[PDB]
Design an enzyme around this catalytic site. Structure first.
Site, mmCIF file in Angstrom:
data_model
loop_
_atom_site.group_PDB
_atom_site.id
_atom_site.type_symbol
_atom_site.label_atom_id
_atom_site.label_comp_id
_atom_site.label_asym_id
_atom_site.label_seq_id
_atom_site.Cartn_x
_atom_site.Cartn_y
_atom_site.Cartn_z
ATOM 1 N N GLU A 151 8.423 5.907 -0.885
ATOM 2 C CA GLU A 151 8.429 4.546 -0.859
ATOM 3 C C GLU A 151 7.083 4.010 -0.967
ATOM 4 O OE1 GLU A 151 10.912 2.516 -0.522
ATOM 5 O OE2 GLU A 151 12.514 3.942 0.172
ATOM 6 N N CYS A 200 5.268 -4.786 0.884
ATOM 7 C CA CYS A 200 5.375 -3.719 -0.415
ATOM 8 C C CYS A 200 6.350 -4.819 -1.114
ATOM 9 C CB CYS A 200 6.306 -2.707 -0.040
ATOM 10 S SG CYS A 200 6.226 -1.766 -1.622
#
Lengths: 508, 509, 509, 508
Positions: free
Chosen positions: A262, A296
């Site tokens: 991730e 993110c």
């Protein structure tokens, strides 16, 4: 501005820790120092783990795993339900630590803790599902099925910016799946993780579960590396920069382990001629500036149709100039501080690079009230109009910078969205039915998350979370992301007492 | 003793089969790479090869094709696969000749491998109306949430000698209905099978009016394989081969943020409990150990037998092994054809010697049969070796027919013996006891990707996800939702409410 | 004006098509029931019929067949269906002749209906390796839990005149791979289509070596249908037909604890918003309203148009309707073939009169075309009727080409107008507005079983579950997991622990 | 024996009611009298509903439905979570009512309440799932999906023997699915339902949900009939005797509505030569005698292999003679009372019939301590050895009677299991792998639930619950049983701006 004092932040952290069941005398030390981006100051020292300690943590998690994996999944779910309740009970204490260590505003800190509670509830659901299949077999008098089994010890490496929710996505799911967990949190955010671990430890005692189900290993990248190399860790979930992917992914692969990666994002929104501009401006501001551009999922690229580009930049300019920047404990604050000096340095370097590459700074970029806390880096989000998608535009700078690019044809907007190496999230703002569908189609946006009339942070528990390309391909949280935490078996069962005789020859 | 067909007669049969499948022999012949047969160990004729540059050109052609194929409705992509399977049906015998010729498999197994191609085509045509994502509730009022699956790109398929057509078929039928295109690097030992497959698919493509670049074969050794693995245009590499190869491919592809399906070695065991039906067990164990001359990845290599019946089980297998008909794989009587090459024979003899040095007793087989009948070929009687412990050689995959026999007392000891090896493909338990059967399949039972009851380690089918755990590599092919590894997931939130959560209540309009 | 083929020429084409599909004409001819064509309205030739006793004999044959079929591995049952679809492909043109002859459909729609049979066969072959149940965790230590699906029994299929082969195919391809057997009662108006279908399936069965009783056709009127519905040997009745029939079948089957799939009338609407692409909308609306001469269940019968564009939309449809080529359905130029019979023409005229009595204006069509060209046949121009409200006739399904035009202002008024009728099959919205599109598909939007954006009310395909809500009857056919209605669910807990919870701790051993 | 006094039972019920938030002055009346099978005595009178009141309840539930159905499913799940917690908080109070009205022992009453709590938790999971599908379309430039939407008002009619759990399976699932609920409980067990409704009403207030989500209509079969006839109730879930199926099923079908039918059972277990007899005897006793043979899952037929039949009957005889029968508030009690006199009368009539049909009463059947509570019907479970599966054996008598039948071949045991008109549950006890698989195979037991080495009550939340044949075909609770509470839509979306032109003709 009026910024909370270091002394009062320290005392709020110690109180939140002791209320979540942390023993302050046991965790204190001088190997790693806990800190706060609100003032930049040190809070206090902590014990840290040796590489030998990581291997002792792995051995303890694996010993627990051998009991947990034959504990019925709904019993395992009872534990996660119990942990959800303790999280609910201590929601404000945990949130104070998230604000103190990550620097995010109080409402977002509370929302991150609620995310943990929501995944617990979902995992309790999963604990009666974890579905495989039954299906026909071509063989007379046989039966065929597909089953799912606990994998083992799961290594969870997490980042500074969501210091509790990322772990919670992994641990709630991993625990109902019959796995155990070794957690290596960011060296920037150890206090949140200790608090988390003590609450789950209380849940374990209340539930009668095994002791080693979850283990926290405090330290820097070297402690993460030892965890990554362990032959007893068949799954590493790693969240962090795209940089990390090239190290972790191949290492784990070389020992035939599994990863969930991730990594970084560089998320764009497309604003079409029919876009609702009030909606677009609110959505874009919140996604670009929220969390001081340190998600993110942060909005970093705005791809605007040329017919509306001036109006959009003008309106974003005015909004960016009005953003309230301040102490993240004050409810009026929308933008809290950047995590450290290096983060401020990189932001400034990207902006200088963007202007060298032909860009124009339209608003923001200045450090705010430096004398009020000279160790802290409070900055106004930068809005930068770019004549093309240059080098700097394609790199993720983990800071609030919004690059504005223009297009004419929708296929070029799609191309510009997809041209970058990252692949987390994308959004399109449009009133047009066909444009919205074209953006989501197989030849549309290439990202893990692709949305219509909501920004690049538009995601939720029930959705699988993650990205493509250099975001690393991993998924967490929703849908059937649980499958990455278990191993599939295909089972053929013969109840006929017979086998096919090769060539009609028989050895009875 | 046995009669073996001649290299000239095999060559002529191969040339016929290729011509009939639409291969232009003039165009594929050359001097770079040599086609061969394990029946005699001889070279057949030379072939052109592809350079590493040709691979890059072929990948880019495949990518151009993908740009059209991904917007071709999946049910239309399915129609192509249906037609391909029609041509496979029509040329089943011809393609099965080439499989026997290059892999050394007996006729019935060669026909069975081609049928497997046909079956995955049929299954894929079904998938082409499915490829299911999901619709689900969203917490956001006036919004909708869903999950969609999209075509990925060019799929690199690296296959082994032992299943020269089925492995590619599993990948390609599925990849193509999923909107992907395929670049196939077959074993350097088995190129002709691949050329015949590709020529039939090229006909299907022409009949369907589909893009020319959907599938391409690149012929050559592991260096051609490496260039495919390294291509930044190939988001998925499906590699089938030895465990050794996994440590090359998996990390290389991971380093460039790509995806792999790894289908590596096995070292598969069956547990024989005291209540086992010995007739069923002996027949099952024979086919699983001796079939394909021990060169399936699902080959039975370890037999874990309860001490109370170990002596009687060994006698029966000793006698069964001594009666296996070994011969030319084109004869109907043959059960065991030859090993692929001399290297494989060398490793077989090396393992048997090591096993006897490590305390083992050779009970039956292991000898080369009729060497002077075909001096370049290696026909062997399967070996049965009784071992006192699970020593190092027992824990290695030797790709040859060797069955190691280990004894146990408690079922949990049998399970640990099964799980102690580094591989994790397939496992079986022979038992009439309800409890033992379930214990073997339980979370604390057999740790393999396939775990069966009263059927051997080659017991799998199209509808099941095929693959293993541990050093077998984690990949899955063929059935269930194995198709998902060939596509990318997207999570879509759609706002139709006209409004957004205002952070801290602030409205910037 | 138009030229219509003669009864003699149609008869001879029908006899050819039947013979070529393997029907023995001598054996099916008789004097009980008469085959007919809507092209001229004439009788073709007499057929034998089945008595209610014959139905009971046919059900019992089907049940005997089921006792073997349910233990036949589903993938083997799939092989039968694949072969059937091979024969349908080979006889596509022949079977399409019979569809045009009996249903009055134009050639391209007749070919499209037969292809639909082929497509569901392909989809069913895929299902035959799936039919997925589930494995899941159990709260009980040392236990395992799963869900399995099993064959149900004899399936009674009652079909309508308008889709004389596809409806049965949806049911039968799926039923057969699911381990069931089929007894089919086709429309008394369309027996020959069914005899040709059944004869081809009987050939497939013979080639596969499958049981003889897997499928049987029982020819006759609604009294033969009733005996099938009442059979305690038929656990599932799939009935397709008018809404009126549902109140007969559903309660009768419920009273004997059986299951039904009910596929009843529709009264389908499309909403045209101010941002609609008018060219797309007009063409879509034309095909959906006029196709199959308004005798699909998915036929567009109501158009709900925003007042700002209502005048321009009506002009364009008025002109399009006036230009529809009406003719012999074997000619390539024909878009609209005839109504099935005189009764259907009578109900059409009765509805148009009622609509004009209820305040409506007839804008185009409604007149019988070239009556003296085929005096027994009823070729009509589709009617376009502008209505001031949604009155009673508008809320009834008249099975004929009549499009009622209603105006609206607010999208929620359009949605209420869509939902106000007792039927609930299909709905569409024509719009370029992202929000309107999603609002129409939302939980508070269109209440129908099918809800589409920028495609009409006949927009459905094999992969989708086909059916409706409300007085359409709730049943689903064809795609998604519609197969589940043809099987029974079982929930299985398996204890391998050797022990049981002791109530109050008491041990009786 | 020592049986609780009517006065003390009454006072325990009123206390449990007021603690769950019931207003005793509002629910009291003289139209229906609440009662207890512990003494057979009346407790107090209650208001009941007119048929006009049912229609007013339906209208209120439907008005609520119009708001609930666009309330996001995870928000709806938050309500069910909250209700789960209130159930947890009042677990003992609710359990006392279940014991008082249904007469089941205290541990089983507590277990029934826990079932409600477990389905709430599962439904909270479902609220982020309720999965449809996305799939390919054959049409270029189109997209295809399948979605699920709230159906409407759900009529829930329940029986006396599980007076809270059956409703909880239906309401938890229906509420997360966006439906509303009108509940018509047994006229024998109204107090449990009022308590249930008041706890859920508190949850509704705490959650800010609409008021009419759940409504209780107290009365007899006539009130149920009006609910069944309502055109605004598109789904009726009815649990009760097989008798009811022939009334309800066709009525609902005649108005094109949907039903979930959960009717009678007549459940058998097969005991093979390799069966573990200690296990089999414990399992059989608990499933036959538990709840005084008043579960739909009760073990009523034992099909024993002839080689072990004498030993099995001998051991069951000894166990049946030792069963403790008593006040269900006493922890030593295993078998509490039958529900009323009629239930005792029917049991006695079945036993007299079975002996007339060639049977032999081996143990049990006598009423216990009649003078200790002459209005109550405490009976020892009957064990009856039968020479064939005669008429009485094939009928469900709702009382503890276990018929024993013998077989030789497994296919005949399967035939005997399947020969009855009911189809709920079945079990096989065997150590043999192939026999267990044969029992579960397509030509094995024909029931909704088919188990190995666990009895006919072996079922749980995560499994779909219900039966075949005259048990009515319905499923509740687990797997994807939620689909019966929602309506499917198939959606084709065109984003190409084109339609296929019939014959190449164009009307532009």
């Amino acid at each position: 501005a009026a910024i909370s004092g270091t002394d009062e932040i320290r005392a709020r952290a110690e109180q939140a820790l002791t209320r979540c069941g942390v023993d302050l005398t046991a965790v204190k030390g001088d190997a790693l120092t806990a800190r706060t981006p609100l003032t930049g100051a040190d809070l206090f020292g902590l014990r840290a783990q040796t590489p030998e300690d990581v291997d002792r943590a792995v051995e303890a998690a694996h010993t627990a795993f051998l009991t947990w994996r034959t504990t019925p999944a709904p019993v395992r779910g009872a534990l996660v339900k119990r942990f959800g309740e303790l999280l609910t009970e201590h929601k404000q204490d945990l949130a104070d630590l998230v604000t103190i260590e990550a620097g995010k505003i109080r409402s977002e800190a509370l929302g991150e803790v609620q995310e943990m509670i929501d995944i617990c509830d979902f995992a309790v659901g999963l604990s009666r599902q974890l579905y495989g299949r039954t299906m026909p077999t071509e063989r007379p008098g046989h039966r065929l099925m597909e089953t799912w089994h606990p994998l083992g010890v799961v290594g969870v490496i997490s980042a500074f910016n969501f210091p509790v929710a990322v772990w919670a996505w992994n641990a709630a799911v991993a625990l109902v799946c019959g796995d155990t967990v070794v957690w290596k949190p960011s060296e920037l955010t150890p206090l949140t993780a200790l608090a988390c671990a003590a609450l789950l430890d209380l849940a374990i005692a209340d539930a009668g579960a095994p002791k080693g189900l979850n283990q926290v290993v405090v330290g820097a990248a070297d402690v993460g590396e030892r965890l990554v190399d362990s032959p007893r860790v068949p799954l590493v979930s790693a969240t962090g920069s795209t940089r990390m992917g090239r190290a972790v992914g191949p290492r784990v692969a070389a020992r035939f382990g599994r990863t969930i990666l991730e990594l970084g994002g560089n998320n764009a929104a497309v604003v079409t001629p029919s876009a609702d501009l009030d909606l677009t401006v609110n959505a874009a501001v919140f996604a670009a500036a929220g969390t001081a551009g340190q998600r993110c999922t942060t909005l970093r690229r705005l791809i605007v149709h040329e017919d509306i580009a001036d109006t959009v930049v003008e309106r974003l300019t005015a909004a960016f100039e009005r953003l309230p920047i301040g102490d993240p404990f004050q409810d009026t604050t929308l933008v809290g501080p950047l995590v450290n000096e290096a983060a401020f340095g990189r932001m400034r370097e990207a902006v200088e690079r963007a202007t060298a590459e032909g860009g124009t700074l339209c608003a923001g970029g200045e450090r705010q009230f430096p004398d009020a806390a000279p160790g802290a880096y409070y900055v106004r989000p930068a809005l930068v109009r770019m004549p093309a998608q240059t080098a700097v535009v394609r790199e993720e700078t983990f800071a609030p910078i919004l690059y504005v690019l223009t297009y004419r044809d929708l296929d070029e907007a799609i191309r510009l969205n997809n041209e970058v190496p990252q692949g987390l999230s994308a959004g399109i703002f449009t009133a047009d039915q066909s444009e919205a569908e074209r953006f989501l189609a197989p030849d549309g946006a290439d990202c893990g998350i692709a949305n219509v009339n909501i920004g690049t942070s538009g995601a939720e528990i029930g959705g699988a979370f993650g990205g493509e390309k250099e975001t690393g391909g991993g998924r967490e949280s929703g849908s059937d992301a649980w499958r990455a935490y278990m191993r599939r078996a295909t089972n053929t069962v013969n109840y006929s007492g017979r086998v096919t005789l090769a060539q009609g020859v028989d050895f009875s």
